[PDB]
Design a protein around this nucleic acid. Structure first.
Ligand SMILES: [Mg+2]
Length: 53
RNA sequence: GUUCGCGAAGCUUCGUGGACAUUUGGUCAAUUUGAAACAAUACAGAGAUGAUCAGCAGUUCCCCUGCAUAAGGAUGAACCGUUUUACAAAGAGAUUU
């Protein structure tokens, strides 16, 4: 042990985070919205295998 | 305070006219009384059907978890009860005018 050179790994993680930014903003943001103002009348979707028949 | 001019005393100091800069912040004010929930105790207690159990939906002025148009919530919640009139036609018997 004692190999430094964290750069490429770091870069990779940064790039991963990029993707998340969006996903988290939809997700976390959505959650917080719900917490403040929690949904009225959701519509289920029969394209699901379950419930189709 | 910066300063660009005027007027008095000794470039230094007072007295003035201007220019520069110009209206912040609050849907809120710090403990009970403007609304959080679980938990706990007590008491019961689990969809059809005889019983045991799966899953899916459905209605709603019920929601929760969930990123969710996934999925999951006691089959997620309440539905299991009440239920007498657009009501006429025919026949028989009885009291009143
Ligand atoms: Mg179940």
């Amino acid at each position: 042990p004692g190999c430094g050179f964290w750069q490429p790994a770091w870069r990779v993680w940064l790039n991963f985070l990029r993707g998340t930014i969006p996903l988290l903003e939809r997700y976390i943001g959505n959650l917080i919205t719900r917490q403040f103002e929690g949904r009225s009348n959701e519509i289920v979707k029969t394209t699901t295998k379950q419930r189709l028949d």
